[PDB]
Design a protein around this ligand. Structure first.
Ligand SMILES: Nc1ncnc2c1ncn2[C@@H]1O[C@H](COP(=O)(O)OP(=O)(O)O)[C@@H](O)[C@H]1O
Ligand SMILES: Nc1ncnc2c1ncn2[C@@H]1O[C@H](COP(=O)(O)OP(=O)(O)O)[C@@H](O)[C@H]1O
Ligand SMILES: Nc1ncnc2c1ncn2[C@@H]1O[C@H](COP(=O)(O)OP(=O)(O)O)[C@@H](O)[C@H]1O
Ligand SMILES: [Mg+2]
Ligand SMILES: [Mg+2]
Ligand SMILES: [Mg+2]
Lengths: 526, 526, 526
């Protein structure tokens, strides 16, 4: 209904590129360990002085509609990189601006956007392949500490606490980060579990910050079979309502009818309940549900042998947990105080079954169940002096933990933009179909130098000469910005996960192609 | 009572054509499988990046009143093409603009708009005749999948689910699409019925999105005869009100008084009851109501042998259904739970009557009742992560259903704009009355290369040479845009319903004539 | 969401420097004993005539965003100097402007900001080393009076009261400053204690002026162990809310659970409670809690001998104090009227144990234990003629207290600006790495005479010749400005703590580097 202003072709692409140029100029100065300083004017108090690319990026909002939406496009892409891999906002932004500007200048000469995009994406796939083949896995906790410290903007405390948590629980363990009311960060191992199923309907989310649902002292309903009837879930809801506690139900599949009833009941004020799918696809589902029932304390409803009907639900027949955190893909049941003697008996039964037989596939499940029932949940409470400080530190710790998980899962590569510099040689092997694909290959190859050049420039040195030396030098040493010398990157501690570099290059190429190939831009009149 | 600005003749037609030019220029870049990108500025969040022409068209609102109303004219015509055949908004828009601009240029030279319109519609009707001539009837489910997948803008999931639904239920079966709470689309066959009658009065509509009326757990009053007395419908409404369920009545004809009473009680807060014309007119009217009474459950009021008066209405004699969704022309009664033993007995009676005699006109009715009581209603539940996403997905799959129906109702025809490229030869057999009808026929034959040229242009190639090759080549191969090569069109699966092309050409010609012949344009003073 | 203006490099640093120049010019005139006069327009009464630089600084807000944020940066840095040392807002401001202007003029010639900052930091470190090298401690109450009078801008009465309070209590004793209704400042010694542990959660703060929590007639709960259960803190809270009196609890560590419960109880209107950590690291903690229990009157809950479970708390079993002041690192319990006979018995026991054996590390602790109970809190009640001039005078007395504590903590140096003048020979021994670090050394050595020059200029004389005479003169005399002659600076009275000079130089150098090395400045559009 609102009157629009419509711009076509390069007329709109130029303005969008101006917006992305302002964004990338603002966020480029903050890149590296020697990142420059940005002062953001606060409308209520003292100005905010930061060297963080995420804050600088989320800070700017342009007045021009076209510039603002180009900046918003690149900015949301960088946010996606940050939220997916824990790092890469500034790198994705500088790569995106490089690719977009080079593509715009090549297209304005009269080239084909589609062929250039094809060449750019073939180059990107080659680079990602080489960067994956050059990755190395983490083998020692010191590498975990290095990765966490780099991902936390050089914060040694965050790296140390994350490495300690991964030492206590495991590299593939369960670590969570909540707020703390004290003045120093504290590491706590508490009893809890986490399994690879998320909420069926995204309508129970209590918290909009991280697409989570947080509950305190929530009842656990277990039903290994489908809900028999409405008169079988209604008594459980009545019991939960009368017992002043929320409900967390886990079953096979609650999609069509009971899910609709729960969603419509969610609209009621004061009614809280979530649904999660059962963890496994066979005997693992049954034994994991038995483990959860033992750890929570209660009874299992719907068993083939016991034939316990959901209609005859009792307060003592449901599980109990302290804190519930359910996400889109994973669900966390925290502080489940069940029968300790029963938990010990179940542990004894599991360890007795461990030394019975091995099949190379079910023994992995048995070891996993032992780990879930034995290894606690690492909680990293974040302390500070005010709400803003605890929030910012919580975000930094969460992002560092995400980047550490990414390093564990895939591996690590040389930091400081050196990983993308060792990916240049493989662009010689590939051959383009036409001249525009070769133009895209050139665009990408003059782009992998941008992160290292930016980091060196922020260090104060003339980054062109440094990257020339880096390319001339061997494949194990690179340029350090803290010390200002070419050092062996791998053991100096300057390493980042393969995932962040992959995601940054992919996101940058995607948004740059979108910026250089968008034909019509529709904006509301100012 | 508000001051108007009035413009006359070409002075207003020029401005309206400027508006339609901006609309068609913005929506023309998103045409084909290779369609360019429109960045639509959202006022509250990130910009909306889309390649879908219906969204681009919905986005555009001009500031100039005359340009805006020209854009709105072509926009609503394209919307009617969409809502009538589920596909053809961008083609209708580009042909609209082509014909309108060509006729405007031929009329500014001093031609007669009436003679040009006559020639244009002569040409259009010839093209529609040849396009009916070249249609082919779908004969295999893979063609249904191809049609659904094209009509869904290349979504393979929509094509696959629609083909599975039309394999489970049938090509001319009952398929409905409803929202869903889960994260994936699930196909479900649910017991229901649908007949070819719609609500009598368009005042009971609960849903404004689609001229529909949705109910849950509704009563079904049946009276094969007419309502004898008002004291014969007041007790039924009293029972409905006291039994907390919305009545749904089906009589012969309710127009004069009972319908007026129902409409005046509709304005009461919380009163819900709809009337539906009796389904049949002969013996089918006599037996389909028995079928519905057996399905829902209860008794039939007004029989010629049972004399069951409507005054003695009882809660055990009315029908029951789960969902009632009635449209202007058709009505669906979903989840009618009745005596399954009675339904089995009715099916046994029908299959016994099947092998009794054959009349070549009543066997069809027998098999139709067999299918209505046997083939369940396919419901395609649509799930996602946000109300806007589930609404977009619902609209896309609904349009794909409409286009598949349009394909299985009249046939298919070569896609990619080649359908309108093999209708050009027909324009040489006709002969105009005067020179201006020849002018209009030239306009139309020039307009018939515009869809193929637009698709090729969006693919990155020079569409004129491609359409020259298509007209020089044989009558079975056309130009692909995903693979960028001349390929036999029918085998790969580039086919669209002949109805969408027919409707697009008719709609485009109508709005173009209305734009090049309107003489006075009255607009509110800004 | 707010649109921003983003400025880069010198095109922003220049405007920020203009802001800091306006701020420093306005606050520089008020520097010294002979400080000039500033009239500040009061928008409700008569203008405010002041010679005090903190009011002038806090009085200045520029209309331009970039200038205002440069001014605000230097303002907050000067405020930090004033709030962590009690004196040095104007000296820090003038040094900061000097360093920033000189760095800006050297960088605009083409220098490297990183290297200039490195030279500046090495120069500042050398200067601070020599400042620590030339500091002398306080040896008589006369010097306490001198430093208090200088830190109160010449007020002989503030110096006198602070010196008398330090004579009565001690140079390392508890002195506090509250408001009062009389017309003349009065000194009172009252019973109370203070220990080096502050609050655990910064959410109980009733006072927002000085991050304090102020209570009147508050109950004291003691527990030298972890809270047994919620079923033992609930009765405590019930007792506290039944006897119409707040609670002050001291424990071992209340961070995770009970702290969260006290914070959520802090969110209800009518509930007040604070928590403090245990005072000691061993036997000192136990005996200090014993002393506090005797001084407050009641019982100790949680001993290994008495085993007084926290589930049997009674009103006679809790301690009582008059006024409670809790800060971030310190806690004060004031007017705790316990059993005077029990306090005398405790004092007799302590003085009897003070003659058994000494160990050179626990006799000190015994002295401290006796002093906590024996030395009374010195409260300096401030009063006058209205509400605003009691806040003003209380701020002045508090800042003078802070500077006297800084003097009795590290030492004193030659006032007037000669302290920074005697540190000039330091900068002749250090050697720079390159020419830009020599530029930084020159900047700092030229900056080291700005305060003396400013004080002399405000006196009425050409300060360049005065500082030349001071540098040519012996290392014990310097220019007086209340007399106008070069006098022996040490026995005349003109001395300031080394901590104010050190903090001012650090703060000036830090904000000046920030100002001359900030690359991007983001402000909202006006
Ligand atoms: N000591 C160091 N020397 C060189 N490069 C470093 C050093 N520490 C971190 N880096 C590099 O800094 C880059 C990330 O920093 P920054 O740009 O602030 O964050 P982001 O990952 O959001 O872009 C990484 O590429 C990393 O390799
Ligand atoms: N692979 C393909 N090659 C060539 N044309 C295609 C292909 N897929 C779809 N098309 C054509 O695209 C046209 C429809 O696309 P589009 O313009 O987005 O929708 P609309 O039907 O609303 O105009 C149809 O004419 C169809 O024939
Ligand atoms: N009689 C005096 N002669 C010379 N200098 C003095 C005298 N009294 C105070 N000063 C100097 O004045 C300076 C502090 O005054 P002022 O600038 O008003 O406060 P601030 O410490 O906030 O800058 C100190 O450096 C001190 O040495
Ligand atoms: Mg980072
Ligand atoms: Mg389509
Ligand atoms: Mg002072």
């Amino acid at each position: 209904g609102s009157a629009k202003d419509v711009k076509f072709g390069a007329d709109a692409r130029a303005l969008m590129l101006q917006g992305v140029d302002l964004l990338a100029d603002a966020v480029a100065v903050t890149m590296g360990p020697k990142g420059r300083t940005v002062i953001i004017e606060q409308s209520w108090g003292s100005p905010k002085v930061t060297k963080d690319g995420v804050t600088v990026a989320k800070s700017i909002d342009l007045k021009d509609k076209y510039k603002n939406i180009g900046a918003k496009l690149v900015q949301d892409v960088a946010n996606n990189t940050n939220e997916e891999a824990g790092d890469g906002t500034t790198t994705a932004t500088v790569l995106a601006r490089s690719i977009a500007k080079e593509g715009f200048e090549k297209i304005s000469k009269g080239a084909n956007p589609v062929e250039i995009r094809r060449g750019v994406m073939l180059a990107v796939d080659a680079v990602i392949a080489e960067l994956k083949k050059q990755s190395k896995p983490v083998t020692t906790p010191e590498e975990i500490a290095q990765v966490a410290t780099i991902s936390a903007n050089g914060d040694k405390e965050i790296g140390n606490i994350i490495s300690d948590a991964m030492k206590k629980v495991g590299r593939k363990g369960v670590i969570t980060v909540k707020d703390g009311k004290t003045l120093n960060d504290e590491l706590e191992i508490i009893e809890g579990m986490k399994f690879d199923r998320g909420y069926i309907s995204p309508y129970f989310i209590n918290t909009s910050k991280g697409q989570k649902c947080e509950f305190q002292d929530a009842y656990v309903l277990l039903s290994e079979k489908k809900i028999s009837s409405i008169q079988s879930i209604v008594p459980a809801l009545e019991i939960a309502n009368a017992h002043r506690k929320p409900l967390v139900i886990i079953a096979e599949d609650v999609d069509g009818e009971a899910l609709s009833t729960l969603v419509l009941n969610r609209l009621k004020v004061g009614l809280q309940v979530v649904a999660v799918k059962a963890p496994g696809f066979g005997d693992n589902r049954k034994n994991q549900l038995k483990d959860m029932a033992i750890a929570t304390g209660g009874a299992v409803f719907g068993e083939e042998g016991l034939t316990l009907n959901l209609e005859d639900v009792q307060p003592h027949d449901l599980g109990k947990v302290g804190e519930v955190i359910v996400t889109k893909d994973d669900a966390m049941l925290l502080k489940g105080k069940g029968d300790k003697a029963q938990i010990e008996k179940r542990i004894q039964e599991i360890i007795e079954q461990l030394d019975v037989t091995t099949s190379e596939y079910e023994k992995e499940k048995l070891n996993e169940r032992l780990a879930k029932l034995s290894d606690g949940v690492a909680v990293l409470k974040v302390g500070g002096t005010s709400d803003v400080e605890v929030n910012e530190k919580k975000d930094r710790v969460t992002d560092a933990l995400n980047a550490t998980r990414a390093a564990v899962e895939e591996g690590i590569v040389l930091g400081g933009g050196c990983a993308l510099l060792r990916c240049i040689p493989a662009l010689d092997s590939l051959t383009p179909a036409n001249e525009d694909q070769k133009i895209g290959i050139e665009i990408i190859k003059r782009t992998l130098k941008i992160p290292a050049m930016t980091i060196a420039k922020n260090a104060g040195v003339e980054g062109s000469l440094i990257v020339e030396k880096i390319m001339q030098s061997s494949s194990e040493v690179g340029y350090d910005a803290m010390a200002g010398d070419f050092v062996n990157m791998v053991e100096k501690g300057i390493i980042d996960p393969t995932k962040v570099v992959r995601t940054a290059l992919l996101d940058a190429a995607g948004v740059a192609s979108l910026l250089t190939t968008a034909e019509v831009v529709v904006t509301e009149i100012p």
